Design a protein around this ligand. Sequence first.
Ligand code: HEM
Length: 110
Amino acid sequence: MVNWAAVVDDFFQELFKAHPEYQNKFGFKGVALGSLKGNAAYKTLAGKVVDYINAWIGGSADAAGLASRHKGRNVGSAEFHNAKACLAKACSAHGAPDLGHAIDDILSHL
Ligand code: HEM
């Protein structure tokens, strides 16, 4: 039983460390990284990312839909390549399987 919630938390720490400006697009803009887990906007968003990972594992993920919604937020290939690397670190740090192919699937629609 992978703790995907823990992996996603480390994913966002990696993501926003390397690219702080990405955080500006979220409802938790401006919040200190060490404080994120206590922020209500963050908790909801991280929960949806955990949901997406479990949908991919479970076979129900909609990569086309997720890509389209991110393009709608002006988030594209460059950002998702960066996210891929950040998620790879977060999985490794928790002994979790690599999610590279899930990200590749989103990338194919970007
Ligand atoms: C591993 C890569 C990523 C995954 C799996 C992912 C997944 C998700 C999910 C499931 C949502 C919830 C709403 C929806 O389903 O569309 C979401 C929202 C969002 N994501 Fe991502 N995302 C990723 C990378 C990124 C990156 C790099 C950015 C760069 C800024 C980003 C920006 C956003 C924004 C702005 C929202 C909406 C926030 C809001 O409505 O308040 N995402 N993402």
